[PDB]
Design a protein around this ligand. Structure first.
Ligand SMILES: N#Cc1ccc(CNC(=O)N2CCOCC2)cc1
Length: 281
């Protein structure tokens, strides 16, 4: 059981060592499309690339490339798109992906500015009366409502396909309190946030996969999916203690490289799952 494994690693301070074994066991697949010279300005970080086999393709004939990966967790019935924070030139591609994949929710785990640098383009409208038009992808986005709480903001957005005049409602879940350095002290507000996303229906199989991002789409984004999948597997299995976080993480790393960036994010993932299990047993 992971509570006991947690105490072992913690008491022994072996987190950097566990983390290194995961790094060494992790899959490595080609990412040829990401490294094409015509795609250089579609990537925020040169060392963070989607694998060719799991990459999301845009339905535009010119250039189908976006830095985004489909994570498919077959047993858990869960699929996630993990992507980078959009760039000024890819905001239109981002919303095209949301449209094409029939996603109901966008989960954002960063602030637009952190450590005095921009981590993400402002890709949603700040006021009801000032909608955004993405000329390159023929989409219109309107802020319908905004509910600001202490730890997160939920926004209702209307996305309109200007080509066909279909409209969809998108929910934007914005976790606003992840600190500039390190991880939250307690996982309570992160779990609250994860249960709010679940309650919305955004993670349900009726819809396309949820879009999850931070800056690179691997660190905080990774913690989100790992905690959700682990808690789901503990509800589904005859023996909840047969859930090995390390085996789940390695499975997700077949779909996108570098999920969980630091030994601290790994420790935080254990703590989130351990604490979330109490609200689930
Ligand atoms: N969705 C999902 C998902 C399921 C399994 C894994 C890793 N394998 C695993 O946990 N086991 C349990 C013990 O017997 C079989 C292998 C990762 C993700």
């Amino acid at each position: 059981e992971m509570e006991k494994e947690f105490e072992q690693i913690d008491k022994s301070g072996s987190w950097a060592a566990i983390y290194q074994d995961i790094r060494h066991e992790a899959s490595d697949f080609p990412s040829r499309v990401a490294k094409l010279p015509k795609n250089k300005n579609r990537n925020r970080y040169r060392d963070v690339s989607p694998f060719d086999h799991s990459r999301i393709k845009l339905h535009q004939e010119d250039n189908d490339y976006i830095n985004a990966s489909l994570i498919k967790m077959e047993e858990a019935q869960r699929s996630y798109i993990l992507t980078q924070g959009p760039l000024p030139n890819t905001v239109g591609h981002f919303w095209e992906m949301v449209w094409e994949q029939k996603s109901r929710g966008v989960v954002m785990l960063n602030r637009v500015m952190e450590k005095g640098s921009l981590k993400c383009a402002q890709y949603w409208p700040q006021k009801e009366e000032k909608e955004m038009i993405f000329e390159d992808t023929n989409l219109k986005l309107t802020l319908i409502s905004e509910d600001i709480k202490s730890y997160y903001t939920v926004r209702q957005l209307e996305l309109e396909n200007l080509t066909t005049q279909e409209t969809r409602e998108i929910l934007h879940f914005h976790y606003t309190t992840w600190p500039d350095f390190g991880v939250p002290e307690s996982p309570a507000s992160f779990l609250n946030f994860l249960f709010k996303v679940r309650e919305s229906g955004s993670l349900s199989p009726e819809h396309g996969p949820v879009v999850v991002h931070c800056s690179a789409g691997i660190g905080r984004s990774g913690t989100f999916c790992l905690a959700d999948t682990c808690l789901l597997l503990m509800d589904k299995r005859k023996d909840p203690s047969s859930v090995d976080i390390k085996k789940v993480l390695l499975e997700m790393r077949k779909f996108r490289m570098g999920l969980i960036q630091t030994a601290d994010q790994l420790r935080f993932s254990y703590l989130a799952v351990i604490e979330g299990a109490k609200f689930i047993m």
